[PDB]
C-alpha cells in the first residue's frame, strides 16, 4: 500500500500528476550535463511487474524533447532507479522544461514531474 512505500522511503518521495506514481526530488535549477545530487527514482503504487521500463523526457514550447542521458530504467520491487540521469539540452534562463515520465505497462501510463526544471550552461 501507499503507507508502506512512504515507510520504506521516509521524507524522500513526492507526488506526480498521476495518482499511481511518486518520484524522488530533482533540483529546480541544475547545470547542463552535471551528475544529479539525488539519483532519480520512479515509485509505482499499483502492481507493475519486474523489468517494466520507465522513460523520462524533458521539453517546452520551443523544444518538444530536450536531449537527456540515461533516460531509461527498469522497475524492480515497484521502484525504477535511474543510474545516472543527466540533463544535456538547455531550457535557457527564459524557460523551464516539463518532465514527462512514461511507464511501459500494457497499455503504457504517462505521468508528469510536479515541478518544471531549469537547465543552463552554468546552473545556479
How many residues are recorded in the chain? 124
Least distance to Cl ion, CB of residue 70, Å: 16
Contact flag: residue 99 with Cl ion (CB under 5 A): no
| Residue list 103-122, contact with Cl ion (CB under 5 A) | 120-121
Least distance to Cl ion, CB of residue 8, Å: 35
Phi, psi at 3, each rounded to 5°? -60, -40
CA distances from 116 to 49, 58, 66 (A): 29, 9, 13
Pick the closer one to Cl ion by CB: 86 or 90.
Answer: 90
Cell of 4: 508502506
> What does the radius of gyration of the chain's CA atoms come to, in whole angstroms?
14
| Cα gap 89→101, rounded to integer Å | 17
Least distance to Cl ion, CB of residue 98, Å: 14
Pick the closer one to Cl ion by CB: 89 or 102.
Answer: 89
Pick the closer one to Cl ion by CB: 110 or 121.
Answer: 121
Residue 5 annotated as lining a ligand binding site: no
**Contacting positions for Cl ion (CB under 5 A):** 66-67, 89-90, 92, 120-121
Amino acid at each position: 500500500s501507499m503507507v508502506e512505500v512512504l515507510a520504506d522511503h521516509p521524507g524522500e518521495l513526492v507526488r506526480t500528476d498521476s495518482p499511481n506514481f511518486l518520484s524522488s526530488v530533482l533540483p529546480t535549477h541544475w547545470r547542463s550535463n552535471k551528475t544529479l545530487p539525488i539519483a532519480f527514482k520512479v515509485v509505482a503504487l499499483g502492481d507493475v511487474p519486474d523489468g517494466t521500463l520507465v522513460t523520462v523526457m524533458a521539453g517546452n514550447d520551443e523544444n518538444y524533447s530536450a536531449e537527456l542521458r540515461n533516460a531509461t530504467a527498469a522497475m524492480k520491487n515497484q521502484v525504477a532507479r535511474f543510474n545516472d540521469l543527466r540533463f544535456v539540452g538547455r531550457s535557457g534562463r527564459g524557460k523551464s522544461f516539463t518532465l514527462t515520465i512514461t511507464v511501459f505497462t500494457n497499455p503504457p501510463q504517462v505521468a508528469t514531474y510536479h515541478n518544471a526544471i531549469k537547465i543552463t550552461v552554468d546552473g545556479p
